[PDB]
């Protein structure tokens, strides 16, 4: 019943076994003769064993700038920072003389060091296909008074699967077990692809391309590291007139990267979980599933219409009705026939609607036929007769 | 004397007018028979009347995010932020129903607004060629004790020129006037170019290219909070019809730098430029005069206050102090062979004179190749120094 209200909803009926396709933002409603109707949804996808290949700096900051110069013939200057791997240093020559604090005139050595601090980075992660955990929520069409579209899932059984551990039995309280034998059909195969994770965005790119990016990086081994390799790629030393040396940053490469990542497979991201484009093709066996209460009698009393009939985006209708008679637990009689009550016409979605408690109303979803129809719920006397229109 | 110590120094000599070329980090020393030796340096170039064409945002920030949704058939939602020109808003549709707070099932309108704040921008400035003011410093070789290489210029007469007001007379206190008739020799002409100014960097780019940049901008008139084309850096994502999200497209600073590779880079400094273009001047010294050419020679002895040093161009600078009496008076100076037979080196600081006994004088001279004798003053106590 969770699928009710989502536009990207599929209605799959098995001719015992049934192949369904789950993806994010898509729900699948499965039906089978004398089997409970079930709602499946892919709630979350997670890569749990991702090996950081390389981390690139896309926005950096230079701080703790220190300079030392020497007068001509006084040797090469030196700073301790030149041995600190978090500092980038460069030696040059400046014009020195009387007017510049030297007793004699010549090229005095200069040295400028600055602390390379990354403000924004990009991480490349290698993910093994079999380590992609999926979380599917199975919500049975139990008619429960609040079961309709309830995201909380206090109604559906959550189950986690992986491309290897493809087969799982999930028990549904009151309906038995359902066997699921799933299989991943991602857009691209994770072999030679790198999951380029930046911020809240993510992409799938060629390994060699990733490694060939001209940006400062930290190897997967040194994570939380401070010895950024190739700092030169974002740092530039300028001494054009031999008067003074200046250290200048090359500016955030974030948008540049985004432009470069246009012809790449984008992945949505969320703090180590992924909303992935690909789909999951499962096979579902209902041989162990059973209609709860297949041995129950028909409700005798009359029913009241607690909530106005509503139409879903796929033409089906949902009717929430409350039992006022006596007998509960009892089977709800339901039928959609023509205006002349000659033959049953529409289909039932919420197969086998049953009452559990008189106070708790029941939600029944059915596919009415095109045009004028009659929704008959209950039995005479007080048998509810509602006329419905279907353009 | 300012040129002394700069490697990019030129020694220009003119028969009895003289054409010189000034650029940043280049000094020119001019000499002429019976005329004072002068040091010229281009100290600053400034574009003074630049009309901001457009200002682009290269790094932005979205804050104060606000959302409103409505149930199906309940109309279009609305926020006041939609009327605030600092906010970027967008309407979409989400799946609504019983499980989502609506009495019936359908597409409910949503609207998301966020405050667009620029964190880093780029300004395009149009500069008129004739408005490029140059600041040249003319420092005479006056020998004063500290004049040597003094960047302050408290001894050098500053002069500002423009490609139009090319001809200027500059008066030098004690030496008369010098006529300068300059001309610009830039690399590119400012016609159809825009000076793309970002931070400490600057470039010269095609006008149409500049206007074709897909970034949020503010017109020259609004220099303001109503950033135009905010869409170019903001994106609204609603892929599953459940929720709308507003996401920034990330700083374009480095992207711009990459795009600006095949462009003429200019260095910048808070509205001043370190332009690569050379200024070709002509200098007339007919009104220039050696200060004190009628004074007599010093009789007393001189003292050597500072160790002789050699410049990058082989010239030497000698600081000497007068101990005798007669000041103001002319220092006798000569650089001859070891046998004192004939004068060999040249004088750079022509007509070195003493003003006050306490204040030493800086004399710059070109010694000859090899062994030489630097003779300063006259016997008795005439300084005799040896050069290699």
């Amino acid at each position, epitope marked *: 019943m969770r699928c009710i209200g989502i536009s990207n909803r599929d209605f799959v009926e098995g001719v015992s076994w049934v192949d369904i396709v789950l993806e994010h933002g898509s729900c699948v409603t499965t039906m089978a003769k004398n089997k409970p109707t079930l709602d499946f949804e892919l709630i979350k996808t997670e890569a749990k064993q991702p090996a950081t290949l390389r981390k690139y700096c896309i926005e950096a900051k230079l701080t703790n700038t220190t300079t*030392e110069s020497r007068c001509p013939t006084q040797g090469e200057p030196s700073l301790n920072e030149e041995q600190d791997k978090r500092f980038i240093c460069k030696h040059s020559m400046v014009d020195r003389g009387w007017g510049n604090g030297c007793g004699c005139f010549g090229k005095g050595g200069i040295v400028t060091c600055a602390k390379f601090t990354c403000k924004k980075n990009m991480e490349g992660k290698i993910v093994q296909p079999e380590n992609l955990e999926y979380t599917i929520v199975i919500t049975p069409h139990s008619g429960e008074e609040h079961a309709v579209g309830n995201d909380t899932g206090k109604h559906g059984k959550e189950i986690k699967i992986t491309p290897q551990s493809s087969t799982t039995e999930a028990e549904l309280t009151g309906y038995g077990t359902v066997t699921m034998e799933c299989s991943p059909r991602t857009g691209l195969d994770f072999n030679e692809m790198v999951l380029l994770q930046m911020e809240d965005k993510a992409w799938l790119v060629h390994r060699q391309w990733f490694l060939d990016l001209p940006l400062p990086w930290l190897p997967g081994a040194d994570t939380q590291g401070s010895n950024w390799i190739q700092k030169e790629t974002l740092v530039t030393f300028k001494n054009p007139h031999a008067k003074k*040396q200046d250290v200048v940053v090359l500016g955030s490469q974030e948008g540049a990267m985004h432009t470069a990542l246009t012809g790449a497979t984008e992945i949505q991201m969320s703090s180590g979980n992924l909303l992935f484009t690909g789909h999951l093709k499962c096979r579902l066996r209902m041989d162990k599933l059973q209609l709860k209460g297949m041995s129950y009698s028909m409700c005798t009393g009359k029913f009241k219409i607690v909530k106005e009939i509503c139409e879903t985006q796929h033409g089906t209708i949902v009717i929430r009705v409350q039992y006022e008679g006596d007998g509960s637990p009892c089977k709800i009689p339901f039928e959609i026939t023509d205006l002349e009550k000659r033959h049953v016409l529409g289909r039932l979605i919420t197969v086998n609607p049953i009452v559990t408690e008189k106070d708790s109303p029941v939600n029944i979803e059915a596919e009415p036929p095109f045009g004028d129809s009659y929704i008959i719920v209950g039995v005479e006397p007080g048998q509810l007769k509602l006329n419905w229109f279907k353009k | 004397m300012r040129c002394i110590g700069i490697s990019n120094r030129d020694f220009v000599e003119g028969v009895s007018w003289v054409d010189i070329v000034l650029e940043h980090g280049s000094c020119v020393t001019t000499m002429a028979k019976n005329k004072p030796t002068l040091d010229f340096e281009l100290i600053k170039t400034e574009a003074k009347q630049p009309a901001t064409l457009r200002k682009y945002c290269i790094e932005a920030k979205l804050t104060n995010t606000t959302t409103e949704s409505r149930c199906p058939t309940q109309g279009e939602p609305s926020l006041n932020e939609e009327q605030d020109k600092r906010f970027i808003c967008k309407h979409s549709m989400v799946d609504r129903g019983w499980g989502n707070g609506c009495g019936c099932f359908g597409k409910g309108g949503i609207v998301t607004c966020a405050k667009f704040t620029c964190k880093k921008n780029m300004e395009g400035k149009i500069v008129q060629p004739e408005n490029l003011e140059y600041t040249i410093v003319i420092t005479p070789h006056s020998g004063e004790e500290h004049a040597v290489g003094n960047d302050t210029g408290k001894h050098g007469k500053e002069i500002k020129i423009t490609p139009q007001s090319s001809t200027t007379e500059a008066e030098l206190t004690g030496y008369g006037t010098v006529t300068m008739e300059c001309s610009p020799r830039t690399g590119l002409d400012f016609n159809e170019m825009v000076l793309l100014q970002m931070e400490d960097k600057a470039w010269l780019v095609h006008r149409q290219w500049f206007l074709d940049l897909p970034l949020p901008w503010l017109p020259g008139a609004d220099t303001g909070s109503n950033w135009i084309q905010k869409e170019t850096l903001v994106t609204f994502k609603n892929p599953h019809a459940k929720k709308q999200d507003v996401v920034v497209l990330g700083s374009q600073e480095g992207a711009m730098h990459t795009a600006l590779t095949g462009a003429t880079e200019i260095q910048m400094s808070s509205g001043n430029l370190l332009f690569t273009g050379h200024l070709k001047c002509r200098l007339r010294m007919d009104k220039l005069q050696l200060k004190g050419m009628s004074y007599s020679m010093c009789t007393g002895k001189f003292k050597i206050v500072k160790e002789i040093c050699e410049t990058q161009h082989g010239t030497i600078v000698i600081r000497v102090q007068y101990e005798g009496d007669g000041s103001p008076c002319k220092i006798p100076f000569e650089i001859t062979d070891l046998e004192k037979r004939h004068v060999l080196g040249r004088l750079i600081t022509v007509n070195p004179i003493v003003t006050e006994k306490d204040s030493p004088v800086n004399i710059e001279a070109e010694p000859p190749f090899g062994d030489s004798y630097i003779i300063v003053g006259v016997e008795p106590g005439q300084l005799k120094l040896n050069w290699f």
Partner: antibody
Amino acid sequence: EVQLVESGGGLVRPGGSLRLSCAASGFSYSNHWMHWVRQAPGKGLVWVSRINSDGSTRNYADFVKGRFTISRDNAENTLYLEMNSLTADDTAVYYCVRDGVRFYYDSTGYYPDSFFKYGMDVWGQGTTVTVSS
Amino acid sequence: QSVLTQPVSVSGSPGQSITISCTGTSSNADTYNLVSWYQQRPGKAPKLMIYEGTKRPSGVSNRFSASKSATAASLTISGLQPEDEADYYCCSYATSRTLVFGGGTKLTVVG
């Protein structure tokens, strides 16, 4: 003559920030090194920081682990000291000081030669900073 | 590193010549070659008295002179007058980039 006038001193809460600003006039400011010195009430002088002409060289005392940033605006003839994470140890008078002698050796005031001859010859009246609660 | 220490107090009589020492730890001849001396009268701003170990700026009374050694630097005041009853501080480099002051010496002129 030549004088330096400090501003920005006052009451600040512990952990708070303050910006001191010194206005210089009457001498070629852009070519001089500038220092900040402090003095706790009734106690001795404590050197805090220095900045060269360009601002490319900015040095700080060991007690300011990174909490103060010195800066300058040559065309405005202004010196600044940005202070964060202030504690009771920092209550003091802060003096703006010129290194006039180095000017006599390096008229550019740029080059950060090791152990260069210096002299703090011009001092401001000082601004009182009181970090209290 | 380098730490400069001075005597806490020095007491002199008018007309007398007193000497205030500035000694350093982890210091060398260059520390003292660069020593400067500052006079601070009560409630007044410091005044530069000596720079480069021994040079006296113009305006500073010729009664003030200074000396330096390889282990200490000293300021000498000849002919003590009531007008010089200040705190005196020495200063030099702590490192190639950073300066340090001494703890100060209070000089009393016995009136």
